[PDB]
Symmetry: D2
Subunit: 54 residues, 4 copies
């Protein structure tokens, strides 16, 4: 009863904890994509600076 509802709750926490994990992994992937775009922008910046010195 109390133990039944406790088992339902622990199962439901387990579901929501896996969903929190999955959401963080998605966010990590998005940040990785972002990091790559930033790489490209830094190269382009260094190139523009270099040419202003030439």
């Amino acid at each position: 009863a109390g133990s039944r509802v406790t088992f339902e709750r622990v199962e439901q926490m387990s579901i929501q904890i896996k969903e929190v994990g999955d959401r963080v992994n998605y966010i990590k992937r998005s940040l990785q994509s972002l990091d790559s775009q930033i790489g490209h922008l830094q190269d382009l910046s260094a190139l523009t600076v270099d040419t202003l010195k030439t």
Copy 2:
């Protein structure tokens, strides 16, 4: 100069793509925060019943 204009205009586009992505990420975290709050509540309610047992 013309080449400088071109590279600067390209950077400005790329800065915009990075800005937009940062905000999409910011919004995911906002939404995750809300879901954590409800998980926090479910854990508190589970513990309260366990104390009576």
Copy 3:
């Protein structure tokens, strides 16, 4: 058994809270990043406009 379960759930609720806190820190960092990218976009926009003329 209720007592050991109570103990594992309590420890979960403390860790859930720590996760929640770290999420909100990361969120604040995105907001400041967002604002610094806004400054940079403004700069790139000014630079680009002068270089047209």
Copy 4:
């Protein structure tokens, strides 16, 4: 001449600010790995609690 001068300054500032944006995102990446580590410990505690009530 003059137009170019200011432009050189502006471009020099953009590349400082682009570096900062980089550094910030590197920090966020590291903060997200910590967070993900914490979530793994909670998934583990949650799985053990579950394993222990199945039967």
